Amino acid sequence: QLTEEQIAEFKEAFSLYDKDGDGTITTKELGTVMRSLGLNPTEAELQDMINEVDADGNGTIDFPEFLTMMARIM
Numbered sequence: 001q002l003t004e005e006q007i008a009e010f011k012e013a014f015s016l017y018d019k020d021g022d023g024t025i026t027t028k029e030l031g032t033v034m035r036s037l038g039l040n041p042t043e044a045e046l047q048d049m050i051n052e053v054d055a056d057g058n059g060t061i062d063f064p065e066f067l068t069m070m071a072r073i074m
């Protein structure tokens, strides 16, 4: 049962990571969110996190890939 409200909240969450609005999440953008949680990862640690959900091999996180991260934390 997929609603427009569901889609809107997912969009809101993606947008919190994708600050510059170009549709992909970079290590810089991931780092800003993790440091706000209280963590302090290195650049390489941030790339190992992307590598985990990077289903198309392009090095950064896109919308469907972000959706699988959300599915795992729920």
Ligand SMILES: [Ca+2]
Pocket (backbone or CB within 6 Å): 018, 019, 020, 021, 022, 023, 024, 025, 026, 029
């Ligand atoms: Ca971006």
Ligand SMILES: [Ca+2]
Pocket (backbone or CB within 6 Å): 054, 055, 056, 057, 058, 059, 060, 061, 062, 065
């Ligand atoms: Ca990707």
